[PDB]
mmCIF file of C-alpha atoms and ligand atoms in Angstrom:
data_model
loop_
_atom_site.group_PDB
_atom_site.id
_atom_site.type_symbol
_atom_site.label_atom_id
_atom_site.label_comp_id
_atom_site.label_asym_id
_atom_site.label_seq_id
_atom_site.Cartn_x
_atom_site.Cartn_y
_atom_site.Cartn_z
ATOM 1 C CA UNK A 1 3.373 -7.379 30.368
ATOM 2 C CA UNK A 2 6.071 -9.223 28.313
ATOM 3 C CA UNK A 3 3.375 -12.305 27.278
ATOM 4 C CA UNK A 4 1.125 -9.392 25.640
ATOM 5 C CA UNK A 5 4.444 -7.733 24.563
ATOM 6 C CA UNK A 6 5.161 -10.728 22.730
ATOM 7 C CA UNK A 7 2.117 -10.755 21.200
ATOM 8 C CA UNK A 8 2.324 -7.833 19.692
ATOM 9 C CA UNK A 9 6.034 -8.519 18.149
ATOM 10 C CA UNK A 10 3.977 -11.195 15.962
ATOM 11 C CA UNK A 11 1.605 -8.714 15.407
ATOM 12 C CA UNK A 12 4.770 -6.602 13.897
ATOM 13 C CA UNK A 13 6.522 -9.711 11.920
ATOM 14 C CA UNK A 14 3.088 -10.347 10.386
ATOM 15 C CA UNK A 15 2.657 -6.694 8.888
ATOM 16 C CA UNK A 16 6.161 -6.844 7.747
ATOM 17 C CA UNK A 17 5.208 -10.573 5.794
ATOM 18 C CA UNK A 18 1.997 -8.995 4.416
ATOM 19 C CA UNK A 19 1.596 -8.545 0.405
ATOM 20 C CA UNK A 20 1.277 -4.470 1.693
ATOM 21 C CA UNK A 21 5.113 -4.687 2.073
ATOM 22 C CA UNK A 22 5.753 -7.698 -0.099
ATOM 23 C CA UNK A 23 7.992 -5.383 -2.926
ATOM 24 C CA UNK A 24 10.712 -4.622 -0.251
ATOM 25 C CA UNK A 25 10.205 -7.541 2.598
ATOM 26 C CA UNK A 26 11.129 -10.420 0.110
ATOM 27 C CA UNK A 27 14.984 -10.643 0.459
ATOM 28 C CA UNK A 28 14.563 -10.710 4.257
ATOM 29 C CA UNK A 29 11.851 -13.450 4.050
ATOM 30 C CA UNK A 30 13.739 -16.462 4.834
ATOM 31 C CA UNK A 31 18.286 -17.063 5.421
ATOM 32 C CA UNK A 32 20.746 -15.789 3.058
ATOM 33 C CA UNK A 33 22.129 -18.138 0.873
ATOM 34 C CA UNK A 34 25.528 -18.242 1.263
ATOM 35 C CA UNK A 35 26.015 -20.631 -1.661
ATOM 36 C CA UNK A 36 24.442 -18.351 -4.264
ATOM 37 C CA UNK A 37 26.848 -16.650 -6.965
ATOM 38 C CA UNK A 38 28.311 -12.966 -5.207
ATOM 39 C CA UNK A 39 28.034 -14.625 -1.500
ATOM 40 C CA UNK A 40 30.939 -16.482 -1.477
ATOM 41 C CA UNK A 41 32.003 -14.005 1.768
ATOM 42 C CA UNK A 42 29.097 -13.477 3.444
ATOM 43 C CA UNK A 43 29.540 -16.195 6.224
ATOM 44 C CA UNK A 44 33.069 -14.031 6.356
ATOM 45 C CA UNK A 45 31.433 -10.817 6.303
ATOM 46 C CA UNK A 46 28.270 -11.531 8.563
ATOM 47 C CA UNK A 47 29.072 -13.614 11.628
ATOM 48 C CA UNK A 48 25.627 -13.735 13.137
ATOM 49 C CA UNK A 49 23.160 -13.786 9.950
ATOM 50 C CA UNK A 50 19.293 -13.439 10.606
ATOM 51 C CA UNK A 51 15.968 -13.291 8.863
ATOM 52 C CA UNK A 52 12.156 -12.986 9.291
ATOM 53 C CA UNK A 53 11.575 -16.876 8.925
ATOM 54 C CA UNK A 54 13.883 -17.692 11.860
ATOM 55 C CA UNK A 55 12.283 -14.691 13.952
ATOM 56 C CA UNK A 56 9.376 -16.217 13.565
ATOM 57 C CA UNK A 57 10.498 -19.894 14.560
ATOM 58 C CA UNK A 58 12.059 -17.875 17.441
ATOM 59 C CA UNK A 59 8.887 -16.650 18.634
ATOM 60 C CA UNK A 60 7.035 -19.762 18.135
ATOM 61 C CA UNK A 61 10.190 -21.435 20.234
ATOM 62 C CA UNK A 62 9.779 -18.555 23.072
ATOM 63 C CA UNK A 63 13.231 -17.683 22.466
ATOM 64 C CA UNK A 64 12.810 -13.959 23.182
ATOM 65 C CA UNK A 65 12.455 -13.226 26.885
ATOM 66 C CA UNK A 66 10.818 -9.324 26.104
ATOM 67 C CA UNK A 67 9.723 -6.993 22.550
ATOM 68 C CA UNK A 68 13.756 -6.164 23.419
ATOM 69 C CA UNK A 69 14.891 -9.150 22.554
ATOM 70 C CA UNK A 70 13.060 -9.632 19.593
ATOM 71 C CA UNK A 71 14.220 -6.498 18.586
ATOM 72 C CA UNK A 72 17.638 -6.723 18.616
ATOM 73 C CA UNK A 73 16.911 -9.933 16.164
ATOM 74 C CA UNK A 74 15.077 -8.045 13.758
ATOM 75 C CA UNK A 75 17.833 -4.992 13.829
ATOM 76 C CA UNK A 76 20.269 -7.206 13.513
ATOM 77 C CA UNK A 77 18.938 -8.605 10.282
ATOM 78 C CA UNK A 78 18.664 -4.929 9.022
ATOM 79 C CA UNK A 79 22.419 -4.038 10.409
ATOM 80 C CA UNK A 80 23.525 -7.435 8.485
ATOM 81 C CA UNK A 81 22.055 -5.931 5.254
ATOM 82 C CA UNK A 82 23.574 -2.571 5.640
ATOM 83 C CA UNK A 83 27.210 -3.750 6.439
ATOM 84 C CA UNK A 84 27.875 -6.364 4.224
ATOM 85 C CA UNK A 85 26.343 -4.161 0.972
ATOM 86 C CA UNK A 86 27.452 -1.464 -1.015
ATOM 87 C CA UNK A 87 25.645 1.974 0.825
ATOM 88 C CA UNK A 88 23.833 2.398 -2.810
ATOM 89 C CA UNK A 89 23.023 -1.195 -3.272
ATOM 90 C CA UNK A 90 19.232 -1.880 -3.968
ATOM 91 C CA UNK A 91 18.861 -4.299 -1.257
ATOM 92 C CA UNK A 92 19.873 -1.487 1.341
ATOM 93 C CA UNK A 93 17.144 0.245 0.187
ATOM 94 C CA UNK A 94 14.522 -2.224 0.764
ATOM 95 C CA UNK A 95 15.933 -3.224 4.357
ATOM 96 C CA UNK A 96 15.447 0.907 4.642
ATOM 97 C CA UNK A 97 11.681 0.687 3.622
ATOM 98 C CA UNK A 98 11.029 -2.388 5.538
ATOM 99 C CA UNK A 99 12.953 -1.198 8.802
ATOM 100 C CA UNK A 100 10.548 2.056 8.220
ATOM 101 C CA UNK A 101 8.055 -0.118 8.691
ATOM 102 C CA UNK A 102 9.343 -2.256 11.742
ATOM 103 C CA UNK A 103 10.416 0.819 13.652
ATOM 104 C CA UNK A 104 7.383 2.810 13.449
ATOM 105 C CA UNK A 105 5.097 -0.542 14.942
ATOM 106 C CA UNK A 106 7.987 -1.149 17.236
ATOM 107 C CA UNK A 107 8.067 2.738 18.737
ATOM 108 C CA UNK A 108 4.067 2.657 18.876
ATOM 109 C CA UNK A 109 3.353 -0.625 20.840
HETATM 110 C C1 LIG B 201 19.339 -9.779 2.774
HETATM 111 C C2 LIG B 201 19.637 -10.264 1.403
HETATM 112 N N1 LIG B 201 18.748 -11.086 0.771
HETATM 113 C C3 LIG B 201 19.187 -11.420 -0.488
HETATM 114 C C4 LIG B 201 18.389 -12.250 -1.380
HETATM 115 C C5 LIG B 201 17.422 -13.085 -0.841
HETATM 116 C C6 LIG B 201 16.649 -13.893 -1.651
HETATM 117 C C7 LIG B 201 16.825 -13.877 -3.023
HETATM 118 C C8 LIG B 201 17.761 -13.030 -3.583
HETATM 119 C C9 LIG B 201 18.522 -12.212 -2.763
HETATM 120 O O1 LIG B 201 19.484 -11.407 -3.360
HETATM 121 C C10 LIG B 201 19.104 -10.121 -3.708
HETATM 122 C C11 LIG B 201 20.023 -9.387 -4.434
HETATM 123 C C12 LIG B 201 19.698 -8.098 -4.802
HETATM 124 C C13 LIG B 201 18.478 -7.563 -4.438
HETATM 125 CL CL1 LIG B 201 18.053 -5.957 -4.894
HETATM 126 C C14 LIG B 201 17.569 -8.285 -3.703
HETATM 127 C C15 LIG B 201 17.891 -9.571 -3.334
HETATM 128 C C16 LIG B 201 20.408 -10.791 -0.642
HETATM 129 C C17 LIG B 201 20.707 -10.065 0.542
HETATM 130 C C18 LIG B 201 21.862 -9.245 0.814
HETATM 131 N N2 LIG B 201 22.721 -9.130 -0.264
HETATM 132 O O2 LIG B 201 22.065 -8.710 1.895
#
């Protein structure tokens, strides 16, 4: 059922919100600013930008017909991470730890 589905995508954004992940989770917490000193080319860089506050307005909006959908918003936010930074930037490896934790919930529902 994709109403229970659902449910269990908010389920997943909560855990990843949670002070249990808090360390890594926090740069994905709300938009990039694009403003801020070093992201000058981001809005070049990343063409469709995404983050866990706006998944979560999506959800609220029903935006996401199926756990798919959602999905793709909350990879994209991770794929947005690891192509605009440096491979050994420190960011890359928090999106790695947090999309640990997104893909193991995600596989298991
Ligand atoms: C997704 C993302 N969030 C941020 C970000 C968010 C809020 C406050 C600061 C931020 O800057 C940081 C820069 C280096 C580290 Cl280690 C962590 C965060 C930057 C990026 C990105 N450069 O991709």
């Amino acid at each position: 059922s994709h109403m229970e589905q659902l449910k269990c995508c908010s389920g997943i954004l909560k855990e990843m919100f949670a002070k249990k992940h808090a360390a890594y989770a926090w740069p994905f917490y709300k938009p990039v600013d694009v403003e801020a000193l070093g992201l000058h080319d981001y809005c070049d860089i990343i063409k469709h930008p995404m983050d866990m506050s706006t998944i979560k307005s999506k959800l609220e909006a029903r935006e996401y017909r199926d756990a798919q959908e959602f999905g793709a918003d909350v990879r994209l936010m991770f794929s947005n991470c690891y192509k605009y930074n440096p491979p050994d930037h420190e960011v890359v490896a928090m999106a790695r730890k947090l999309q640990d934790v997104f893909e193991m919930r995600f596989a298991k529902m």
